Design an enzyme around this catalytic site. Structure first.
Site, PDB file in Angstrom:
ATOM      1  N   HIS A 162      35.348 -23.136  35.666  1.00 50.48           N
ATOM      2  CA  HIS A 162      36.669 -22.787  35.158  1.00 50.48           C
ATOM      3  C   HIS A 162      37.798 -23.459  35.940  1.00 50.48           C
ATOM      4  O   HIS A 162      38.974 -23.270  35.639  1.00 50.48           O
ATOM      5  CB  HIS A 162      36.851 -21.256  35.074  1.00 50.48           C
ATOM      6  N   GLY A 197      42.329 -17.278  44.148  1.00 49.66           N
ATOM      7  CA  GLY A 197      41.968 -18.379  45.020  1.00 49.66           C
ATOM      8  C   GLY A 197      40.617 -18.194  45.687  1.00 49.66           C
ATOM      9  O   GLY A 197      40.162 -19.069  46.421  1.00 49.66           O
ATOM     10  N   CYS A 219      37.652 -17.827  44.046  1.00 50.01           N
ATOM     11  CA  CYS A 219      36.591 -18.423  43.205  1.00 50.01           C
ATOM     12  C   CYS A 219      35.934 -19.505  44.049  1.00 50.01           C
ATOM     13  O   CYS A 219      36.599 -20.207  44.807  1.00 50.01           O
ATOM     14  CB  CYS A 219      37.282 -18.885  41.901  1.00 50.01           C
TER      15      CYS A 219
HETATM   16  C1  LIG Z   1      39.108 -16.684  41.473  1.00 45.23           C
HETATM   17  O1  LIG Z   1      40.285 -17.406  41.956  1.00 45.23           O
HETATM   18  C2  LIG Z   1      39.785 -15.976  40.486  1.00 45.23           C
HETATM   19  C3  LIG Z   1      39.828 -14.415  40.950  1.00 45.23           C
HETATM   20  C4  LIG Z   1      40.302 -13.047  40.624  1.00 45.23           C
HETATM   21  C5  LIG Z   1      41.822 -13.021  40.762  1.00 45.23           C
HETATM   22  C6  LIG Z   1      42.146 -11.610  41.319  1.00 45.23           C
HETATM   23  N1  LIG Z   1      40.899 -11.207  41.975  1.00 45.23           N
HETATM   24  C7  LIG Z   1      39.870 -12.020  41.581  1.00 45.23           C
HETATM   25  O2  LIG Z   1      38.703 -11.870  41.997  1.00 45.23           O
HETATM   26  N2  LIG Z   1      39.741 -16.460  39.220  1.00 45.23           N
HETATM   27  C8  LIG Z   1      40.432 -15.805  38.120  1.00 45.23           C
HETATM   28  O3  LIG Z   1      41.600 -15.418  38.312  1.00 45.23           O
HETATM   29  C9  LIG Z   1      39.814 -15.539  36.792  1.00 45.23           C
HETATM   30  C10 LIG Z   1      39.919 -16.926  36.110  1.00 45.23           C
HETATM   31  C11 LIG Z   1      39.433 -17.191  34.696  1.00 45.23           C
HETATM   32  C12 LIG Z   1      37.897 -16.810  34.538  1.00 45.23           C
HETATM   33  C13 LIG Z   1      37.410 -17.084  33.066  1.00 45.23           C
HETATM   34  C14 LIG Z   1      37.676 -18.607  32.642  1.00 45.23           C
HETATM   35  C15 LIG Z   1      39.187 -19.047  32.846  1.00 45.23           C
HETATM   36  C16 LIG Z   1      39.687 -18.727  34.326  1.00 45.23           C
HETATM   37  N3  LIG Z   1      40.355 -14.351  36.025  1.00 45.23           N
HETATM   38  C17 LIG Z   1      40.000 -13.130  36.384  1.00 45.23           C
HETATM   39  O4  LIG Z   1      39.263 -12.926  37.302  1.00 45.23           O
HETATM   40  C18 LIG Z   1      40.755 -12.374  35.413  1.00 45.23           C
HETATM   41  N4  LIG Z   1      39.661 -11.635  34.741  1.00 45.23           N
HETATM   42  C19 LIG Z   1      39.479 -11.479  33.402  1.00 45.23           C
HETATM   43  O5  LIG Z   1      40.314 -12.018  32.601  1.00 45.23           O
HETATM   44  O6  LIG Z   1      38.521 -10.810  32.584  1.00 45.23           O
HETATM   45  C20 LIG Z   1      38.349 -10.645  31.167  1.00 45.23           C
HETATM   46  C21 LIG Z   1      39.384  -9.630  30.678  1.00 45.23           C
HETATM   47  C22 LIG Z   1      40.534 -10.106  29.968  1.00 45.23           C
HETATM   48  C23 LIG Z   1      41.591  -9.110  29.466  1.00 45.23           C
HETATM   49  C24 LIG Z   1      41.425  -7.709  29.708  1.00 45.23           C
HETATM   50  C25 LIG Z   1      40.179  -7.193  30.478  1.00 45.23           C
HETATM   51  C26 LIG Z   1      39.208  -8.101  30.940  1.00 45.23           C
HETATM   52  C27 LIG Z   1      41.588 -11.272  35.994  1.00 45.23           C
HETATM   53  C28 LIG Z   1      42.834 -11.886  36.749  1.00 45.23           C
HETATM   54  O7  LIG Z   1      42.414 -10.349  35.232  1.00 45.23           O
HETATM   55  C29 LIG Z   1      42.393  -8.845  35.321  1.00 45.23           C
HETATM   56  C30 LIG Z   1      42.758  -8.241  36.735  1.00 45.23           C
HETATM   57  C31 LIG Z   1      43.425  -8.314  34.328  1.00 45.23           C
HETATM   58  C32 LIG Z   1      40.994  -8.302  34.915  1.00 45.23           C
END
Ligand SMILES: *[C@@H](O)[C@H](C[C@@H]1CCNC1=O)NC(=O)[C@H](CC1CCCCC1)NC(=O)[C@@H](NC(=O)OCc1ccccc1)[C@@H](C)OC(C)(C)C
EC number: 3.4.19.12
Length: 306
Positions: free
Chosen positions: A41, A143, A145
């Site tokens: 990602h 950050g 990931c």
């Molecule tokens: C690694 O840098 C991150 C880490 C997160 C950030 C906060 N704590 C962490 O462990 N990467 C992300 O930010 C990812 C990135 C995406 C992953 C899929 C492909 C595109 C990039 N996003 C999350 O980790 C988000 N999670 C998520 O969207 O889950 C599906 C979802 C969507 C809508 C409603 C419920 C569930 C996080 C930022 O968002 C929430 C805190 C709202 C869950």
């Protein structure tokens, strides 16, 4: 002598962490030999996150679309490929610090150490268990990931987790080092939620044995129980059913303390039904389930207090 949730020394893993940038996204990568692994990602943009097509997005980039930095030294990427949910970046250099290692897919209930990293720099280390619902209760910020989970045997590092995302309940999801997710999760920001979880019965039992190995038997009783009778009580308190395999695994611990597994189950059954009574076990007021039978033998001494 004490009992702590301790992690494995992180040294061998620190020397494998690098920073990987693509577009406006920057995250951590794992550098072993001449390959760098990281969440695919990393090639996504703000708009690509909701419904990304990685093969499409990836074909649109080249080796120089990726910036890989080790410490204060840039690494030249000379190839790239996609393995499931991970990216395989081949670099012109082989990591001098590469330790003996292997890739393992951890099983539910098992534990491992996580080396939290940011911008390729290790910030902390802690132990956690792979939950039955396939998530882990870690501590990750934006950050993180690319940060990895691992176990160590002698001098061989078994990598078993790479971080990718966080779910609504504040729990975390990721993949093994082959890019295959743990759980029914996908790397897309579409609504997803952790499934219902359950207490890891085998670990709670292991933890009780550790308590005995360390001196106290206050929770034990004169009763015993049928594997079947125990499981009826297990369902009520949302504990995983105990199996004969689990009983077998607790064998060594049973022998060191002289306490029959089913007798300990009787002890557990009683704790679940009556409570702690304001008393503590190994310093805890609740039943811990983040220690495997292996973790107990590893930490405790081979000689019980008695
Ligand atoms: C690694 O840098 C991150 C880490 C997160 C950030 C906060 N704590 C962490 O462990 N990467 C992300 O930010 C990812 C990135 C995406 C992953 C899929 C492909 C595109 C990039 N996003 C999350 O980790 C988000 N999670 C998520 O969207 O889950 C599906 C979802 C969507 C809508 C409603 C419920 C569930 C996080 C930022 O968002 C929430 C805190 C709202 C869950």
């Amino acid at each position: 002598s004490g009992f702590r949730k301790m992690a494995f020394p992180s040294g061998k893993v620190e020397g494998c962490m690098v920073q990987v940038t693509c577009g406006t996204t920057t995250l951590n990568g794992l550098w072993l030999d001449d390959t760098v692994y990281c969440p695919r990602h990393v090639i996504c943009t703000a708009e690509d996150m909701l419904n990304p097509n990685y093969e499409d997005l990836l074909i649109r980039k080249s080796n120089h679309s990726f910036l890989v930095q080790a410490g204060n030294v840039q690494l030249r990427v000379i190839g790239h490929s996609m393995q499931n949910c991970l990216l395989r970046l081949k670099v012109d250099t082989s990591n001098p610090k590469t330790p003996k290692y292997k890739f393992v897919r951890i099983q539910p209930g098992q534990t491992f150490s996580v080396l939290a990293c940011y911008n390729g720099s290790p910030s902390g280390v802690y132990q956690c268990a792979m939950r039955p619902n396939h998530t882990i209760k870690g501590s990750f910020l934006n950050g993180s990931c690319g940060s990895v989970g691992f176990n160590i045997d002698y001098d061989c590092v078994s990598f078993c987790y790479m971080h990718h995302m966080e779910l609504p309940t504040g729990v975390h999801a990721g993949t093994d080092l082959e890019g295959k997710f743990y759980g029914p999760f996908v790397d897309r920001q579409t609504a997803q939620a952790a499934g219902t979880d359950t207490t890891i019965t085998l670990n709670v039992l292991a933890w009780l044995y550790a308590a005995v190995i360390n001196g106290d038997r206050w929770f034990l009783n004169r009763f015993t129980t049928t594997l079947n009778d125990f499981n009826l009580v297990a369902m009520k308190y949302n504990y995983e059913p105990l199996t004969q395999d689990h009983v077998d695994i607790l064998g060594p611990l049973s022998a060191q303390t002289g306490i029959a597994v089913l007798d300990m189950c009787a002890a557990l059954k009683e704790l679940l039904q009556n409570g702690m009574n304001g008393r503590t076990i190994l310093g805890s007021t609740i039943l811990e389930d983040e220690f495997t039978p292996f973790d107990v033998v590893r930490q405790c001494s081979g000689v019980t207090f008695q």
